[PDB]
Structure formats: structure tokens, C-alpha cells
Design a binder for this molecule. Structure first.
Ligand SMILES: OC[C@H]1O[C@@H]2O[C@H]3[C@H](O)[C@@H](O)[C@@H](O[C@H]4[C@H](O)[C@@H](O)[C@@H](O[C@H]5[C@H](O)[C@@H](O)[C@@H](O[C@H]6[C@H](O)[C@@H](O)[C@@H](O[C@H]7[C@H](O)[C@@H](O)[C@@H](O[C@H]1[C@H](O)[C@H]2O)O[C@@H]7CO)O[C@@H]6CO)O[C@@H]5CO)O[C@@H]4CO)O[C@@H]3CO
Length: 476
């Protein structure tokens, strides 16, 4: 009797490319590509397990632009330039980026503490600031290849910085190839999401928010977004087809968000399986175990992720010693394995790129320990999404209805319902009345709605500029 374990790492970035200037206004796609988007599947070169990945189409677009050398990234230019060539504004951007990342373990360089305590930085000090910002985001592969430059920790030259930059772009250029390879070799399945990561249930029926939060205020949805919901799905199928040669059979619904209407739409567009959140299951069925394969109306297969295990990795274990965290995770799997008569299916689903910057050494001790341990536990079998979808010796259940929601507490309050988030929806609704091109789809991404109210969110002025620029461009 085995326990079936399914990792599904979700990779996504909103479009940071300003449509009028073509400039990438934030470097987050660059830094997560060099740190995470190649290196997370690249663990499969060293560990004999299965790991699955979701890539959103808008992320794939940006990875391609960087790999082709076409991305004009404003923060990266401030890093690349000889400090003598820096604008005052670029020096300011470098310093503020450092300040906003200073406390993360991946920024744990003595030289950074030195530089940030200096009243004034000369050329050699700025060169170190530039190069250490680059190296702070170094991924697992290049942390070994560039270990000597990392251990320097200071006194970098322009040549050395340029060497690191070239190696970083090599990693980006190999990134889509590694997803194809692990897919073709059967080491993992690759899924995608509706194109710009929107909240499909709201686009189909904004009143679905009242299924869980009756007291929320929402704006007057005076236009229909139902066709756009279809377009997000169809365009995502086409993008995946371009990259991998086949249409996608699995999708990750953004924010784990489902509803009866959304599940019907995924079915109608030919999607065979998705996953969503355990809280949705609890809200939808009086007594239900998350370790079964569910069939929604016999139309589409649904797995509900194990929220505790997913949250332990995403939120908890950065604060633990790495062996203890792995011991805790395996011990929880042991309890699941011993608690049921059948073979349970355990979905661990979370973002694959955002938690590691808070772990010691970029989560590498944790993941190397975890994967090394997993491959040696005879009673755990890790599965691709394909294997989980088709596995015969598991328990199944049919369900007829779900209560619409997301993995945020089973509801939509992270993106709608306060005065400021609703203002953005009003802007989008009014722009949709006059939209003439697919930039209105870009503006429907969930990324433009989560930060309104999150005191503590860095660069919200840039997100506001991007959203409003996409909305204006959509009407031309
Ligand atoms: O929009 C920019 C953002 O885009 C993508 O993130 C998506 C993500 O792909 C979606 O799945 C979803 O994420 C969930 C998270 O899974 C969930 O954990 C939670 O996220 C909260 C964090 O846990 C919490 O720590 C805090 O986030 C901080 C974050 O720690 C800071 O580092 C900083 O985030 C910046 C990122 O560093 C930067 O890479 C980029 O983020 C991308 C992200 O990489 C990409 O995957 O920009 C952000 C902002 O500058 O600040 C934040 C805020 O203080 O709070 C978050 C949100 O509550 O919930 C989200 C939403 O359900 O959605 C995100 C965002 O759309």
C-alpha cells in the first residue's frame, strides 16, 4: 500500500512590460527566471522523483523575450552599467531595491550591510552593490558553478559582473528547453493557466462572490466578461501548443479559483483535470477527504490540494532547520499513510518561486534534503499529473456542485470588496465597454487587484502604472 504524492509548482508573473515604451518596469521576471524557473525543474536532473509544473502563458511570453535579448529591463540596466555611467535616478533605484530586499536570507552578505550603512558610495562600492544584487538571486545551478565569485562577497569588477550576467542569460535561454525535456522524459507533467491569470469565476459571474461572503460590496458589472473568460482559456491552449506541440490536458486555475460555471468552461474547452483548494472542498461537501480523485459531474477530474502540507512549505519551513522540516513533512505523510485503508493521493500545490528567498541558502538545503529523502522512502510514490489523473488503484468520488472561491480562505476578498480594489474593477468595467484589443485581457489578471490594502506591498505605484497603461492601451 503506497501513498501517492503529487507536487505541482505554480510559476507565474504578470506582464511587467509597459506597452507604450516596451520597458519592463520591475525585474521580477528576470530574477525569478535566473533563480527559480530553470532551477526548480532542474532538481529532476539530480533526484529520481516526479515533480509537476504550471507555467502561465504571460510568464512564458516574458521568458521568451528575455531569452531572445529583446527585454528592455530598467532595473537590470542599472545593474549592468559601469557605475560611472549611472543616472542619479538609477543609483536611487539600486539602493531602494536593496533596501526592500535587505532582510531576506538570500541578501545575507556582509558587504551589503557595509554598503547600506555608508553615507556615500564610490564607483567600487556601487559595483559591489550591483553585483551583489545580481548574486543574491543566484539559482542552485550557478551557485555551484560560480561558488568562487559568491564567496568573494566584495571587490567585484565590471568584467566579473558581466560574466555573471552572461551566465544568467544562458540559464534563461535554457529554461523552456528544460520544461520540454522533463515532460518528454516523463519526469513531470507541465500545465498552464488561462492566459493572464484572471479570476475566471468572477469573469463568468461576478455574483459568485456571494456564495461565501454575503456582506461584501462589489461594483456594478455593467459589461459581460464571459467571452473574455473563454478567450483566456483558448489563448492559453494555443500558447502551450506553440511551446510543447500538444494542447494542454491539465490546467491550474488561478488562485485555485473554481465555481460551477468555471468548471463547466474548463470542461467545454477540453481540459481533463485541474486542482483547487481544500477549503473549497470543505465548503462544498459535508464530509469529504482530500485524498480521493473527484469527478465534477463526470465531466472533469478535480483534486483538492492538502492545504496543511502546501502551507508548511510555502509559509512555515523557512523558519525551521532543514532536517527538522523534512522530518516533520515525512512524519505527516506517515500519519496519512497509516490512517487510511486505500492508497491516498496527496496534492502539494503552491507557487514554485516565491518562498525560497526566505529560506536559508535559497531553500537548497531544504529541497535537497526533502527530495533525497523522498526518493528513498519505498512507501511513497511521487506521480506526474498524468499518472495521478489515470491511476487506477485510488479512491474516487463524484461531486455535483462547488461553492465558488479561491485558496484565500475559500473566498474572493483578496481581490474585490474593499473601496480601493472595487475602484480598480470599476476602471476595468468602464474600459471594457470601449476595449478594442487584447490588452483588456492583460488588465483582467488577478495581479492588479491583490495589493490594494496590503499595507507593506513594495512598488505598488508600478503595479498601478502598469494596470492603468494596459487599460488605456486596450482602448486604442
Ligand atoms: O503580482 C506580482 C507577483 O506575481 C506573482 O505572484 C502571484 C502568484 O503567482 C499567485 O499564485 C498568487 O500568489 C498568492 C501566494 O501564493 C500566497 O502565498 C499569497 O502571497 C502573499 C505572500 O505569501 C506574502 O508573503 C506577501 O507577499 C509579499 C512578498 O513576500 C514580498 O516579497 C513582495 O512580493 C513581491 C515579489 O517579491 C515579487 O516577486 C513580485 O511578486 C510576483 C510573484 O513573484 C509572482 O509569482 O512582486 C511582489 C510585490 O512587489 O511583497 C509581497 C506583498 O507584501 O503577500 C502575498 C499576497 O498576500 O497570496 C498570493 C495571492 O493569493 O498571487 C500572486 C500575486 O498576484
Amino acid at each position: 500500500k503506497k501513498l501517492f504524492l503529487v507536487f505541482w509548482w505554480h510559476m507565474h508573473q504578470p506582464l511587467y512590460r509597459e506597452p507604450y515604451t516596451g520597458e519592463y518596469l520591475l525585474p521580477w521576471t528576470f530574477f525569478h527566471a535566473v533563480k527559480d524557473y530553470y532551477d526548480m525543474p532542474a532538481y529532476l536532473k539530480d533526484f529520481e522523483i516526479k515533480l509537476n509544473f504550471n507555467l502561465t502563458p504571460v510568464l512564458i511570453d516574458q521568458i521568451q523575450e528575455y531569452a531572445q535579448g529583446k527585454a528592455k529591463d530598467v532595473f537590470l540596466e542599472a545593474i549592468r552599467k559601469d557605475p560611472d555611467d549611472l543616472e542619479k535616478e538609477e543609483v536611487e533605484k539600486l539602493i531602494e531595491f536593496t533596501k526592500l530586499n535587505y532582510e531576506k536570507p538570500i541578501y545575507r552578505f556582509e558587504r551589503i550591510r557595509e554598503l547600506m550603512n555608508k553615507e556615500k558610495l564610490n564607483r567600487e562600492e556601487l559595483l559591489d552593490l550591483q553585483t551583489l544584487n545580481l548574486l543574491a538571486w543566484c539559482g542552485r545551478t550557478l551557485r555551484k558553478d560560480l561558488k568562487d565569485l559568491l564567496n568573494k562577497g566584495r571587490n567585484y569588477t565590471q568584467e566579473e559582473k558581466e560574466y555573471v550576467l552572461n551566465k544568467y542569460f544562458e540559464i534563461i535561454k535554457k529554461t523552456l528547453s528544460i520544461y520540454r525535456e522533463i515532460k518528454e522524459e516523463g519526469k513531470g507533467s507541465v500545465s498552464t493557466s488561462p492566459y493572464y491569470h484572471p479570476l475566471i469565476p468572477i469573469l463568468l459571474n461576478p455574483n459568485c462572490v456571494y456564495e461565501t461572503t454575503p456582506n461584501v460590496k462589489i461594483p456594478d458589472f455593467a459589461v459581460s466578461f464571459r467571452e473574455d473568460a473563454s478567450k483566456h482559456v483558448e489563448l492559453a491552449k494555443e500558447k502551450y501548443f506553440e511551446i510543447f506541440g500538444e494542447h494542454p490536458v491539465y490546467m491550474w486555475p488561478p488562485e485555485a479559483s473554481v465555481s460551477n460555471e468555471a468548471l463547466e468552461l474548463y470542461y467545454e474547452k477540453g481540459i481533463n483535470m485541474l486542482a483547487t483548494d481544500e477549503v473549497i472542498l470543505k465548503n462544498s461537501v459535508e464530509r469529504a477527504s482530500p485524498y480521493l480523485r473527484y469527478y465534477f459531474r463526470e465531466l472533469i477530474s478535480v483534486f483538492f490540494r492538502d492545504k496543511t502540507l502546501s502551507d508548511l512549505i510555502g509559509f512555515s519551513y523557512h523558519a525551521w532547520n532543514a532536517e527538522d522540516a523534512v522530518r516533520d513533512f515525512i512524519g505527516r505523510l506517515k500519519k496519512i499513510h497509516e490512517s487510511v485503508d486505500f492508497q491516498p493521493v496527496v496534492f502539494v500545490v503552491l507557487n514554485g518561486e516565491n518562498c525560497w528567498e526566505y529560506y536559508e541558502e535559497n531553500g537548497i538545503p531544504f529541497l535537497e534534503k526533502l527530495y533525497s529523502t523522498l526518493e528513498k522512502e519505498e512507501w511513497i510514490e511521487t506521480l506526474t499529473l498524468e499518472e495521478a489523473m489515470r491511476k487506477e488503484d485510488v479512491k474516487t468520488e463524484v461531486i455535483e456542485s462547488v461553492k465558488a472561491g479561491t485558496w484565500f480562505d475559500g473566498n474572493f476578498l483578496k481581490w474585490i470588496g474593499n473601496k480601493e480594489k472595487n475602484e480598480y474593477w470599476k476602471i476595468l468595467i468602464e474600459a471594457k465597454k470601449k476595449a478594442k484589443n487584447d490588452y483588456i485581457l492583460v488588465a483582467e489578471g488577478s495581479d492588479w487587484f491583490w495589493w490594494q490594502g496590503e499595507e507593506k506591498a513594495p512598488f505598488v505605484e508600478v503595479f498601478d502604472k502598469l494596470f492603468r497603461s494596459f487599460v488605456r492601451r486596450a482602448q486604442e
